[PDB]
């Protein structure tokens, strides 16, 4: 009990109104919860943007807006931003504690696609005497961050030996990711052509080796 | 300037004990609190407690048992212990300002730390086997040469990777590390103008904090 919900995703476009909800399982939000709304980017970046409601922090941008809706705490964005994409958390306060919500996914449309950089790395001589063989495959500067990343080995399509990260962020707000294929030294000797393919949002890009 | 800085034990095992330190700068805290909350992998955040300026704390009540917060007025630090680790306390765990005087009362976190992430496992420290990628298909490109490093099967994270001794800043990817069996393996690349290698060495260097291991691996064609 003095469980926050928040709506777990939702979407919008550049120049729109996206409203935000939270929710107290104990009743209605008051102002003495003082709903602060907090903002999470890309690699644990906390920033804090409404405090007590409804009052704005001094950096944040005038299209941050928080008030009460009925029962419930709102975080309203007038005119919604590509760079409003984030995490926001919901918390409340209950007397002698604090209690954070679930948190919102916000998806902004209308960001500007990047298509991935492929490369495919051979086993290395030294780590074939250990009888292992990895192929790694690094995929750079795609934006959005999910791809698919298929292997074949001299033509047929690999099912099992392969795993792939997370994508990541890069600096320049591009995501990144690495896709490994281990074989035994004996698999790597028995076969010639292996393929790294990555598709990203509808295209393929795949690199070979023999 | 406002800053919060934590520091903690990076590997714990399960049934024992975490202490993580806040650092503050930029504020005393005889004038503020500070509030320690945590973020399990995959999951939102959760309130652990606050330190008043006074002194007096809170808990969050589910915790209540297991969990303690003390400060240092004249050393600027804040700790948090945890006992009774299950594998479910890894987690990143963050301290944030405690702050009120406002024109209407409230109170807000205002200033968040940059987080430390802690792993509870009862899993071996593993130092990293290092590996040279190198283009095999040695066929110009372009006018520039990708290489890289395979860091692969140690435990726990990080392990820092530095190309000639952080000379070659020069595009340098760092990957995530993928993680089988206890074993992360992570790479890292190096991209360099073709005319200059392998004419000119290019050397990947790599530490493994909790092994104290130190690993230079020379990319040859």
């Known amino acids: 009990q003095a469980v926050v919900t928040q709506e777990s995703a939702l979407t919008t476009s550049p120049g729109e109104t996206v409203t935000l909800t939270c929710r107290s399982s104990?009743?209605?939000?008051?102002?003495?919860?003082?709903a602060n709304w907090v903002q999470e980017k890309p690699d644990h970046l906390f920033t804090g943007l409404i405090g007590?409601?409804?009052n704005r922090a001094p950096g944040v941008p005038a299209r941050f807006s928080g008030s009460l809706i009925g029962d419930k705490a709102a975080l309203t964005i007038t005119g919604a931003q590509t760079e409003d994409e984030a995490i926001y958390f919901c918390?409340?306060?209950?007397?002698?504690?604090?209690?954070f919500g679930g948190g919102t996914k916000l998806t902004v449309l209308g960001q500007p696609k990047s298509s991935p950089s492929v490369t495919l790395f051979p086993p290395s001589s030294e780590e074939l005497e250990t009888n292992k063989a990895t192929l790694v495959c690094t995929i750079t500067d795609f934006y959005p961050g999910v791809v698919t990343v298929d292997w074949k080995v001299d033509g047929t399509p690999v099912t099992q030996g392969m795993e792939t990260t997370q994508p990541s962020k890069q600096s320049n707000n591009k995501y990144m990711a690495s896709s490994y294929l281990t074989l035994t030294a004996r698999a790597w000797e028995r076969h010639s052509s292996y393929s790294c393919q990555v598709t990203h949002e509808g295209h393929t890009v795949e690199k070979s080796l023999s | 300037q406002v800053q919060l800085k934590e520091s903690g034990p990076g590997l714990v095992a399960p049934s024992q004990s975490l202490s993580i330190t806040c650092t503050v700068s930029?504020?005393?805290?005889?004038?503020?609190?500070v509030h320690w909350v945590r973020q399990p992998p995959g999951k939102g955040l959760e309130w652990l407690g606050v330190?008043?300026?006074?002194?007096?704390?809170n808990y969050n009540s589910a915790l209540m048992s297991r969990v303690s917060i003390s400060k240092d007025n004249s050393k600027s630090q804040v700790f948090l212990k945890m006992k009774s680790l299950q594998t479910d306390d890894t987690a990143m765990y963050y301290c944030?300002?405690?702050?009120?005087?406002?024109?209407?009362?409230?109170?807000?976190?205002?200033?968040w730390g940059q987080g430390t992430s802690v792993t509870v496992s009862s899993a071996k420290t593993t130092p990293p086997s290092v590996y040279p990628l190198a283009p095999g298909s040695a066929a110009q490109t372009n006018s520039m040469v990708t290489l890289g490093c395979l860091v692969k099967g140690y435990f726990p994270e990080p392990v820092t990777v530095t190309w000639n001794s952080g000379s070659l800043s020069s595009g340098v990817h760092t990957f995530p590390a993928v993680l089988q069996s206890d074993l992360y393996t992570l790479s890292s690349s190096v991209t360099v103008p073709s005319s200059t290698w392998p004419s000119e060495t290019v050397t990947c260097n790599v530490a493994h904090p909790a092994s104290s291991t130190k690993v230079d691996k020379k990319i040859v064609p």
């Open positions: 944030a300002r405690d702050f009120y005087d406002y024109d209407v009362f409230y109170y807000a976190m205002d200033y």
């Open positions: 930029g504020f005393l805290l005889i004038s503020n609190g």
């Open positions: 330190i008043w300026a006074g002194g007096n704390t």
């Open positions: 104990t009743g209605a939000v008051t102002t003495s919860n003082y």
């Open positions: 007590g409601t409804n």
């Open positions: 918390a409340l306060w209950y007397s002698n504690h604090w209690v």
